[PDB]
């Protein structure tokens, strides 16, 4: 299991999609055509704040790396686009890119 | 935001 990171919220042109961006030491880091080592989790149904279900995906990058990038708005944005295209390159989905990072929430509970 |  990987530890909670932040929670990106975006639609999918069919539904609400949260990308639970988590982290774990097991995953290799990349720094110190650019790609980033990250798992691409399996979909799980979670309920939004309203009370209607939606699809969350648990994506995990190198943990030690991650605490470095959670301070850089730039790195931040760079990882989220990538992962979104991982969920697209594996499930189609055609996620919306007008995504928001939740201020409060860091997950939609179900790490694995 | 609606969810937060």
Numbering used by the authors:
A (entry chain B): 49 to 80, 96 to 175
B (entry chain D): 8 to 11
Paper text:
Interaction with Tel2 involves the N-terminal segment of Pih1 (Horejsí et al., 2010), which contains a conserved region of unknown structure (henceforth, PIH domain). We determined the crystal structure of the mouse PIH domain1–200 with single-wavelength anomalous dispersion phasing of Tel2-peptide cocrystals (see below) grown with SeMet protein (see Experimental Procedures) and used this to phase the mPih47–179 apo and SELDpSDDEF peptide-bound structures, which were refined to 2.1 and 3.3 Å, respectively. We next obtained crystals of a complex of the PIH domain and the Ser 488-Ser 492-bis-phosphorylated Tel2 peptide. The phosphopeptide binds to an intensely basic patch in the high-resolution apo-structure formed by the loop connecting β strands 3 and 4; the faces of β strands 1, 2, and 5; and the coil segment C-terminal to β strand 5. Electron density is evident for the Tel2 peptide from residue 488 to 496, but side chains are only well defined for residues 489–495. The Tel2 phosphopeptide binds as a 310 helix stabilized by a backbone peptide hydrogen bond between Asp 491-C=O and Asp 494-NH and reinforced by a hydrogen bond between the side chain of Asp 491 and Asp 493-NH. The core of the PIH domain interaction with the Tel2 phosphopeptide is provided by interlinked hydrogen bonds between the side chains of Lys 57, Lys 64, and Lys 113 from Pih1, and the side chain phosphate and carboxyl groups of pSer 492, Asp 491, and Asp 493 from Tel2. This is reinforced by hydrogen bonds from the side chains of Asp 493 and Asp494 of Tel2 with the peptide NHs of Lys 166 and Ala 112 of Pih1, respectively. An additional hydrophobic interaction is provided by Tel2-Phe 496, which slots into a small crevice formed by the side chains of Ala 112, Arg 168, and Leu 171 of Pih1.
